[PDB]
Amino acid sequence: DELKKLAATEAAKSITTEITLGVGTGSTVGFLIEELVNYRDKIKTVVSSSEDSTRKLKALGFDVVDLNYAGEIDLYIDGADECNNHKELIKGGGAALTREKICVAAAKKFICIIDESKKVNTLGNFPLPIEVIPMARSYIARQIVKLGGQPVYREQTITDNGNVILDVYNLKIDNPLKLETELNQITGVVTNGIFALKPADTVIMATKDSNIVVL
Amino acid sequence: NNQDELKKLAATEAAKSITTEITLGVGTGSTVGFLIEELVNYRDKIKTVVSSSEDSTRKLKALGFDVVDLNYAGEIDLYIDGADECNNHKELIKGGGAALTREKICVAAAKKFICIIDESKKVNTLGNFPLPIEVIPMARSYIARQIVKLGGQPVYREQTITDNGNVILDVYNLKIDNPLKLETELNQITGVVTNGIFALKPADTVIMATKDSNIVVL
Ligand SMILES: [Br-]
Ligand SMILES: [Br-]
Ligand SMILES: [Cl-]
Ligand SMILES: [Cl-]
Ligand SMILES: [Cl-]
Ligand SMILES: [Cl-]
Ligand SMILES: [Cl-]
Ligand SMILES: [Cl-]
Question: Of A127, A153, B56, B96, which is the most exposed, with the fewest CB atoms less than 10 Å away?
Fold first, then answer.
């Protein structure tokens, strides 16, 4: 908590000029959003990847704009579910996989905040989310099995764009770039949760000893 | 209306491939409309119908066919659909009617894909028809910037929302030297749902009706 405020404060320090800021989703991002009151004069435009964050930003007086109206994001700040030694991530375990990935895609710089528990040497212990067109769900699950993954439909979840989620277990993702590409080619896959083709630019990590290391 | 006669001939000929009890998948568009009319004569072999669009589903129901969700159907034995362009290698451009996503899913789940066209669709090089791409609406501007970087001119298709709730960018002025590579590259763009190049999984058979009112099989 004090740790979260510290990691979020570190991230906020990257806001040094007038920018279009993009904001992610999750619990450490919550602390970032509170800290943004100290950078209001530099936050020209805010884009959000999730309803929760948007509610929180609006409560502090920030106007949140649609990405199509904002144009390019200068700086996107978000958490992750897993991070490896090359700033490649698994994200999407919560809400908003597709919105988060679009925001990262449109961002000049992506800062990812994590704690050390999420740091791994190989991605895959945390299940990989994949957003899929509903009509293709079973077809895609079958192709995922051929890759060695165990797909599990995420019950009672419909995404912002009317799709469903398969959470994929049992993968040892030693080549995130190649698996991300492969999953992209499966017909009916909208988005997958590997962020490797466009990895984080900076990772701020809160350590077991409650200090901050910037990678 | 000669073109319509050609379309009917191609469709009729394709329906002759329904020779046993099957799960049939149905495409979308004007040529497929004539196929759907012909299906009444094959009603007893069509155990399950999967549809690539709510448009086709309306037409199927008007003729008393039940339509089943692909997840329940499993695999399609035979999928029959049209195309906006078809080259010499049975690679296609599709999505002029905005149903490319469900179409491509049906092709992916099908054992055999027959493409039905009149000769106006046949080209030596793909690229004479703007390339449709279904995109997540929030990503529209981002993807358009990426398409420009690739050398194309993205045009939002006005007044069109797909069955999946997304929008269409038609990409003009983009050469397709290497269809499988370009299909792969467009799939990498965040927010792209599907692109209209059908080359990674091409048609198995193309039935083309020509002006003499003859058939050509590829
Ligand atoms: Br693993
Ligand atoms: Br040509
Ligand atoms: Cl947005
Ligand atoms: Cl499933
Ligand atoms: Cl049922
Ligand atoms: Cl179409
Ligand atoms: Cl646009
Ligand atoms: Cl190629």
Answer: A153
In a mutational test of the B interface, the residue from A48, A131, A190, A192 whose CB has the highest number of chain B CBs within 10 Å is A190
Shortest CA distance to A98 belongs to which of B9, B132, B142? B142
Q: Looking at the complex, report in whole angstroms how far the Cα of residue B1 sits from the nearest Cα belonging to chain A.
A: 35
What residue type is A130 in one-letter code?
I
Distance in angstroms (rounded) separating the CA atoms of residues A119 and A3: 16
Method underlying the structure: X-ray
Resolution value, angstrom units: 1.6
Give the right CATH number for B125-196 from 3.30.70.260, 2.40.440.10, 2.10.110.10, 3.20.20.80.
Answer: 3.30.70.260
* DSSP strand pairing (B131-135 vs B76-81): unpaired
Instruction: State which amino acid sits at residue A88.
Output: E
Q: CB-based burial of residue B155 (10 Å sphere; 0-12 exposed, 13-18 middle, 19+ buried)? A: middle
CATH of the domain spanning B1-124+197-218 = 3.40.50.1360
